[PDB]
Amino acid sequence: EMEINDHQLSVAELEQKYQTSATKGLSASLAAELLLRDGPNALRPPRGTPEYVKFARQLAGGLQCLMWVAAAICLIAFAIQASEGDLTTDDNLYLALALIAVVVVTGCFGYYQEFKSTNIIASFKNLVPQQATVIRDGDKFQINADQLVVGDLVEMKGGDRVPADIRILQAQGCKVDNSSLTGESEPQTRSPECTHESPLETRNIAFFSTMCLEGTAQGLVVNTGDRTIIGRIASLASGVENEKTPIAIEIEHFVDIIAGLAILFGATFFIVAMCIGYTFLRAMVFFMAIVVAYVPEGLLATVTVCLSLTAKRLASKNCVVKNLEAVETLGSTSVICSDKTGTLTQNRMTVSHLWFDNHIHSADTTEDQSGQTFDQSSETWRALCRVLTLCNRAAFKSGQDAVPVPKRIVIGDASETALLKFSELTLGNAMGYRERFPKVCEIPFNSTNKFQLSIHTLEDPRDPRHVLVMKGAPERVLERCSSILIKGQELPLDEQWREAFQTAYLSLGGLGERVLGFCQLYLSEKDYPPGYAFDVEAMNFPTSGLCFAGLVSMIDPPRATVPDAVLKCRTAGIRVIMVTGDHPITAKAIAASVGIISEGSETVEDIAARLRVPVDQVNRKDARACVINGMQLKDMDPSELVEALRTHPEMVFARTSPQQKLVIVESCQRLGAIVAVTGDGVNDSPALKKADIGVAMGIAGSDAAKNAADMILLDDNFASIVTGVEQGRLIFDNLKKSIAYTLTKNIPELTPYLIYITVSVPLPLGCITILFIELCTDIFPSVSLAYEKAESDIMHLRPRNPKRDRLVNEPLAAYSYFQIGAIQSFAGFTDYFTAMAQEGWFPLLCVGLRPQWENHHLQDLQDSYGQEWTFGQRLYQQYTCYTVFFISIEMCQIADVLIRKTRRLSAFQQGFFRNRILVIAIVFQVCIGCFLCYCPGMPNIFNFMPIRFQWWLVPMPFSLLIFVYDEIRKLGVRCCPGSWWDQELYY
Amino acid sequence: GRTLSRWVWISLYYVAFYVVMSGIFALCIYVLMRTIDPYTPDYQDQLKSPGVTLRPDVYGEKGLDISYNVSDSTTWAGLAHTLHRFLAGYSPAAQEGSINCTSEKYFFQESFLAPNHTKFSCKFTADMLQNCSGRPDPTFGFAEGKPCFIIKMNRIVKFLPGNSTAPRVDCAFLDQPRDGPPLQVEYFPANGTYSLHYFPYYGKKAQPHYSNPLVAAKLLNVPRNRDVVIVCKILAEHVSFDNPHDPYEGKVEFKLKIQK
């Protein structure tokens, strides 16, 4: 828009373009005018979120679409029947009304389950408006950052948040944190000179969300609000349309199966209806009957509460998810793409190593102090720790004693802050310790002197002399050092040390680490007595011949729990890739420190430097690792991308644009993988949304990354992703356990209807009675399967193939529907005919008897014993065969739930009572089963009546038969993986 | 889907599975149809009180509504024809396989004495009604404006409606007390009784040639050109004649409008 040429202009041109002054700022009137014109200097939130339409979406989905269609068919069947003369029965209306009822109640459930997730992350957000020191009419005052307008004159300090997109005019050694926009963890230096043409890289532009680490600068605002570099990224991120979650994909797969079965049964049973002499209207009604039967009235409710429990499991570990669908994605995920700075690393400069006593000691870089510290015993250590504690001007903010030292806010420079938190950990009360040694002189960091120095009076009067402390660039402090402390003595700095010192300097420099040199000298109390007036212009104190103290190195280190979490995911079969904007060498360094690149793996650039061969000759397949920088990626082609993507498995991307992260995920999803991305900054927000699931850090995460994410890690504990997959992997297996349970019951309710059609026997089962089964008696046992523990070592299995391994498939549905529902159908008929014969009606009498049964005019119909029954009396007999078919289902279902406890292992192995919740659900299946029967008055409220205790036991043999049958099936497959049994009888 | 050689082997499994389950079903029904006694119901849990039927059984909506015009023979020709074809089995020529019952109390048969181990059954012929038999009036009183309505109960195995006296039907209006007198009926047999030697029923197999006892309600008092509602209650101890969920429990109500 306007920034492409902003930084390349002379100041005289800028104060013309924006009608401002480079030294005095805007006029108060014009600065107020520009605010109305361009709007506040802030970011447009998603401005399309009405509260009532978010409810509407919750009513869509694979099951909901089927549920609505089934409901609609009921009405247009009811209307078709009402015209043809049926007298005031509304099971059509009860069924359709209750069908939409679950779609509404589940919709309300999900709406609240995201309204709370979105409200608790809002509880975690800093909610004080950021400030901005602005100059207008030559007056430097502070106002809220949102009130800045294009062209304003602003100023910055250490710790100041950059208020807008600003073009640098003057800057005294100001460096800034670009980790949110770029992957760069090394502080970037800002200068008023045009470093580059691309405004992303040039040094004379400060970015909207960035942090000034040290120094001070002034400049003009060039773009504000959504027009900044940040705003355009979020505008891009919003433009990204997120794909549908794999779990929703899987359910949409089996509704295609249910309808495929439903219309087949309806049509094939409709074409036989005409062949038995049915009216074209009525026969079509039965077809509509069959399809309505095939839809599970309670499946949608059962699924959402299965996912509601695992969201509870993850929210228990400070892992909050927005929508229940994402709760399962991690278990399915096959590839992870992780931003480096902030996500993998702490994005916090910390002391990593030290050199003293001719040895490099590795410091503990963890935030919880869980790693290994160094040898804190030497005399030189106490001297080195003193110099780093004293020659440091940074300071902790007021009242932070409770929050951990790494997370403390410090007023100070980038390196001074790190050296401060170091001493506060190793010593404790560092700033109180250093106040025991008063200051008498100081020289802050300067270009002409090149170092920082301060002289201090000692602690006790027994030593009246003074101590001089200095720190700076290692090579510039050594030129002023004459001796070095080693092992309790002070040795002359001969040529042995100078060659041994620079090797360590260049040793730690190759790690990409910032390294500072330290030195000291004790001022003689005779040459420099107490009260000596040290002059700085005429340096009357030794700026040379110091005694070198040691070397301290600092780097942006990884987070504590990530270096092992990455290992636990690659052992789970997940291909992990790093995608960051930071420079390649720092990227590949962390890629090895965490486990992205294995111990003993080399990029092609590492073979040429080992075999001393030109990179052209180096064979490509021999390289396990490879780093692709952003510049080298643009000139590539999607066919090239897939070539190298699955040639080098340990892949790394560096210096990548936010779009270059988005394209990689697409190139991964286009190859069939389901990708999860973890990030914190705005440079991840676009790639976060397109991903099948987007993980965002709860603290380090930028707002755009947080908003465009599907899951939030509240405490920023990266190790909550590994537990994210097992709970995702568990539920996938625990769903196709629980899903198949509530699908088998569908056959036994349909089969009595379609023999009542073909055979014309008295109606064996009621329409309202199947509702109490689908919606009341079997939901509680159905959800208990979510509490099933892993049958295998679920964390060691490869990620499921999206094509073969499915939530349900032909082996699963065909077995459940047509083998166990078949056995259940016979328990119903067996318990139907006995209730008939034991009440007076023989089997061969019931065949074709239905037209007389429902005839309201036949009030003296003859039973097989000759007795004459009135319509209401035989209606009660119909209500009886309703409830004996009903109970015949339940006794088989208590054997169906247990046999679904495991899919491969025998129930005797893990035990029958592993699931405390499954049994307490089964007890309540029979408690209300005994209530609906023996409750007084229900014979007329519903179609349930108290059956005597003989018919309870009739279907029990079937329940044990299905116990053994699948036991044999499961037991047979586990002992022997049959080349016929595993593929067929296994679901 | 499956391979064309396992398609059939998979098919045989489902066939081999279905036949196993269907075979177990046939083994259960045959045992079931051998568990029960051919001469007596096992539970009969809803036949606590008997139901009552009526002829001519003609319904509009909402149940039995009977309106006819005495001058127009076509409005009642099919009413008597249903009565005539109903009583075709209540003739001596068709009711031969039954005996001359005059015991006047429960006909408790402890043993089966009849051809092919059958049992004795009582006789009830059309002449038991003396004016609603079809002779001398084949219009069954409809032409006179005094139509006969035959009333008969349902048969229940070994059910006893009381020792005290004969169960008698009692027809009347749903009270329209003041305007017009109460309904006057002459029942046949007189007093509207069912002889007690018709009880108890022992089963269609036990008594292959059994037939229900009947009484007729020759309506005499009904006015013409008015919609009236008649209820015919059975009056005995072991009979409940008012159950809201079965309006035909020991009672029959019907709409009647005789027009001239």
Ligand SMILES: COCCO[C@@H]1c2ccn3c(C)c(C)nc3c2N[C@H](c2ccccc2)[C@H]1O
């Ligand atoms: C209950 O007494 C009145 C008859 O009720 C009908 C009915 C009855 C039983 N059923 C069973 C056991 C199953 C599985 N289905 C039905 C069903 N289905 C009919 C329908 C209505 C609307 C759409 C589709 C079908 C419905 O009218």
Ligand SMILES: *[C@@H]1O[C@H](CO)[C@@H](O)[C@H](O)[C@H]1NC(C)=O
């Ligand atoms: C049956 O017995 C009664 C009573 O004696 C008698 O009136 C009737 O004529 C008898 N019927 C026959 C067919 O003998």
Ligand SMILES: *[C@@H]1O[C@H](CO)[C@@H](O)[C@H](O)[C@H]1NC(C)=O
């Ligand atoms: C019944 O028939 C007899 C003999 O024919 C007759 O006297 C009597 O009036 C009839 N009863 C009625 C109510 O018509």
Ligand SMILES: *[C@@H]1O[C@H](CO)[C@@H](O)[C@H](O)[C@H]1NC(C)=O
């Ligand atoms: C009865 O039928 C006759 C002849 O059909 C007719 O004249 C008379 O109006 C009818 N009665 C009524 C009430 O309609």
Ligand SMILES: [Mg+2]
């Ligand atoms: Mg970042």
Ligand SMILES: [Rb+]
């Ligand atoms: Rb159903």
Ligand SMILES: [Rb+]
């Ligand atoms: Rb997403």
